[PDB]
Design a protein around this ligand. Structure first.
Ligand SMILES: [Ca+2]
Ligand SMILES: [Ca+2]
Ligand SMILES: [Ca+2]
Ligand SMILES: [Ca+2]
Ligand SMILES: [Ca+2]
Ligand SMILES: [Ca+2]
Ligand SMILES: [Ca+2]
Ligand SMILES: [Ca+2]
Ligand SMILES: [Ca+2]
Ligand SMILES: [Ca+2]
Ligand SMILES: [Mn+2]
Ligand SMILES: [Mn+2]
Ligand SMILES: [Mn+2]
Ligand SMILES: [Mn+2]
Ligand SMILES: [Mn+2]
Ligand SMILES: [Mn+2]
Ligand SMILES: [Mn+2]
Ligand SMILES: [Mn+2]
Ligand SMILES: [Mn+2]
Ligand SMILES: [Mn+2]
Ligand SMILES: [Mn+2]
Ligand SMILES: [Mn+2]
Lengths: 219, 219, 219, 220, 220, 219
């Protein structure tokens, strides 16, 4: 069962409303790398993850992501409230969709569950979550670069910081399985080609060198 | 510039056509975890990755994924050719869309670029690619469990094996950046909350224990 | 702030796992009339509804819908557990996506926020919510008719009951505004054609008769 | 069978072409709350509604919405006509998609039938139609606020007015069944929790969580 | 302005209801190659086509496609009528979405305007329409192969026949402009590579890569 | 088997980076009429086209379209490089998605395979391809009109030229089958209404006149 207390995870503090910025911020409300993606991805995984500890962790983090979604929603509300008459607002999708957050991204695309990567095996799920967190942190960085005021910026820095934290959580979980630095998982024995690297576009590195790989220079 | 030689990466060998299986196999042609997703994800990343070595690696692997896409296409062609009159075929989407592969998944959904995770920073891209590979390997495992004949199975095992190989390539690339086992990347200094773990759903593990985290048992 | 208790709102009791029914039940997990649609529609509205009482009501109901989502997910989990060798399971999308719920409908479509109807005016939102509850109730009735065992049916009858409850709540909120049975709302004065009915397609009712309307028999 | 007369229900009259506004107007052409949504929703319902009176009503209204769609199309055409040289036009999706209406919304999203709400019981359909009309009216109000000239505004006011009329029609149909203010419909009897209100977000009270209608559970 | 007569162009006659076939038939209702696609594509083009003859043709054909859509709808209704108890019906999307047509394809995908191809030059539009008709015909052929009874089949044969007629109409319109067999259109002159064929996949030859039309580059 | 040479088919030469134009150019990268649509449409057709000559032609052209896709991507890269402080860049989707191409259109829509028209009969495929080339040519013309500098324009004029070339190839293939100017194709005999024209909307042309048609003036 889910419950809600009405206070956000911390105070929403901003300067003058900047609705063009609010539109960019929709990325982290209803966009691919956003808070709904994170919350729903981790929560839906929890239904098929058999490891009780990792299942709990997924639920703990998912609930935090819902709190982040709320914070982002409150930021968008603050940056789109009471500025109907401004040229800035009239240039945004809020002018036709209404003020406040909506489950779409900065380009007006409806959130889709096609954004989610999950299923089958906890190792796939955790690797997917490390990727999700990387997209979330990246988008927060871009938004921070475009910050309209110091209060908005500090909130975004906090949210970004929490995705680094989550990344570390997922890495610890994967490492506990022995699968953070080992490529192999699942139940299928590989064939004899696992070490081959084909030079199909024609650079050397650890990804195509001894000891790990047999380099095929001219496939 | 791209080029094509008409022989596939190895011989397509199957038993009797199994078009219901061919429909499942569409996952790896036009589905989320499929070969187009992999090829396009890695290829589009190569345009914004500044590291010359990793850029080449992305292109090398992308071109292999296109060859995998071809192999999967040829498998679907073989399992849907010349069986128009069979009850099995009439129950599949091929009956109305035509024989052979199409860029949709096993449920008939059109492939969408919403399946892709990419942008901004090579560390995000590589983490996204490790996730993509995990989804691809997972789906191949499910398809192997449902294999209609030994020849089809061996091809799928080969493709699965190559995604383990790619996973290792991406892990080596990330490790060369120092970012396979370190959660932090990007250009934003975190705030003071990076070590906090909130017990919001109420299990202990390395993801919420000392030394790494300060456990908040009752947020 | 959101928080989570691990007990669902009641115990999942089913008979023999029925994975084909589990796929049908996805309608109420990731489908248009499902629990995610309800939760997200009412929650996102709460960010722009200024009446404190109605804002709170929307949040109270949204959190219940999240609990419903959990119940539905647990039913899908139960009906897809340890049956992956059965022909029934192999005929479902779970065979390639993995056991348990996914944010898709019964046809394999990814959930999309295009399913939501929200924005601008609390009267629009509440009418949208009465419509959403009607779709939810409808779908639960169809699932009840198709239910595989008594325990599953019982849970669905409860879920259906709560959507009748929610309908009444939304009606009471609308009536409190004088807008349950008054068609007019918003800030634009109607012109002189407001009470006209054009017979563009001879059936008669209070939707095209005095005292409500002037009937144009031949436009 | 369908037919078409080449005259719209009233001819367009606009000021200077405003292609940025034309893009906003796409919301009522190919958007969620737009005229195609209304027309297709009511028309597709007419196939499975057994009540002859309500079936006819749905078809009557669906045909009017198709005329509204044409009107909006003509407005968009007028506001993107002979202005392809202007910086305004170059800033809009018409610069790459061509002049005139397209079945997209103001954000360039393709119209999708995921916007429709229909199926099963006539009560579900009528309640969905009251909701669609509310959305349609709302969008027209925002477009009226943003409108470029008086002629365009007057047309949008007319279209908005007709959605208020349609709302009333759907309300009268529902009331004709006794289901306008009765929440219950369908063939499943509610269980014993039907009158409970759970205070899951916490203290605001109203008729939605107070007697006589509800038993309030203050601490679930 | 649009109008509607309640009689379809010919009334349905089917055998036993076949709801699995009804689901396949959704392809021509809410699918990519279906009647809504054809109707909306030709209608939306009519707003930006300046040639009066071709504009009228597009509207003429668009109205026929709307009648086709109605016919397909009625077929789907007939094939999902009074069979909700049957195992066949329970296996179809109608069991959860309700009887009758829905703006979905045979796979349960919502119709999307991404299925449309339109904009800019009349030649682009007419070539898109020849392609849409080819897709429409193709899907009807597959449905005819799969058809459940003679009455249903005969209707689908008729609909297919009309798409052949429409193809001819679009071809005659294009030919009327001299652009049926002339690849060039628009206002940009081709550069010097216009006649080159690159053998990028390798040796098959045909009129598409041989003189007189092309200079063949055997090893790019 | 696919392989890749790193030289694009010609050198990217632009003037000052113009990120707003780069966003427009996305139409031909991830948009409906773009290069990915062309490449994937012709390639996927090649799996079910049995005429060896036409199969090969489809593959020859598809590989060229992939080279075009690369050219377009390199143009977008060039026009979004090292300008992220400019107000122009900050107004584009690149500001939150990262520099360089993405598989989206100029409106931020994810590419979808719903853009493709393919299946069943080589005549359907070739007609679909003539239509795709027309859309591609149209979009290139609009971009040329909007081009930011001479070098960019030059590349676009070349790309446009090749779509005229491709159109001619598809016409020659169709004509080789006798189906460029013959409306009829497929395996179903037409009924007796095939030469009728209904005047459902008084303009006349060879599309509703003898010798081709019998004109029904009043249906
Ligand atoms: Ca957009
Ligand atoms: Ca979109
Ligand atoms: Ca290389
Ligand atoms: Ca499906
Ligand atoms: Ca779909
Ligand atoms: Ca916990
Ligand atoms: Ca009437
Ligand atoms: Ca409360
Ligand atoms: Ca060749
Ligand atoms: Ca005419
Ligand atoms: Mn977060
Ligand atoms: Mn996170
Ligand atoms: Mn692969
Ligand atoms: Mn791979
Ligand atoms: Mn519910
Ligand atoms: Mn509810
Ligand atoms: Mn209307
Ligand atoms: Mn209306
Ligand atoms: Mn038709
Ligand atoms: Mn046609
Ligand atoms: Mn091209
Ligand atoms: Mn081309």
């Amino acid at each position: 069962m889910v419950f809600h207390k009405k206070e956000p995870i911390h105070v929403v503090n901003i300067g003058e409303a900047n609705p063009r910025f609010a539109q960019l911020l929709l990325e982290q409300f209803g966009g691919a790398t956003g808070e709904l993606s994170a919350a729903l991805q981790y929560w839906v995984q929890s239904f098929h993850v058999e490891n009780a500890g990792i299942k709990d962790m997924l639920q703990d983090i998912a609930i935090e992501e819902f709190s982040h979604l709320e914070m982002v929603g409150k930021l968008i509300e603050a940056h789109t409230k009471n500025v109907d008459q401004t040229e800035a607002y009239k240039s945004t999708l809020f002018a036709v969709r209404g003020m406040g957050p909506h489950f779409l991204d900065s380009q007006g695309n409806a959130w889709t569950a096609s954004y989610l990567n999950e299923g089958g095996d906890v190792v796939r799920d955790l690797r997917a979550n490390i990727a999700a967190e990387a997209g979330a942190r990246q988008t927060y960085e871009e938004l921070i670069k475009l910050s309209p005021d110091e209060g908005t910026k500090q909130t975004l820095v906090h949210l970004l910081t929490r995705e680094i934290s989550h990344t570390q959580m997922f890495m610890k979980a994967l490492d506990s399985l022995g699968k953070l630095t080992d490529p192999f998982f699942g139940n299928v024995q590989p064939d004899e080609t696992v070490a081959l690297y084909y030079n199909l576009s024609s650079e050397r590195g650890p990804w195509n060198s001894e000891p790990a790989f047999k380099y095929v220079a001219n496939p």
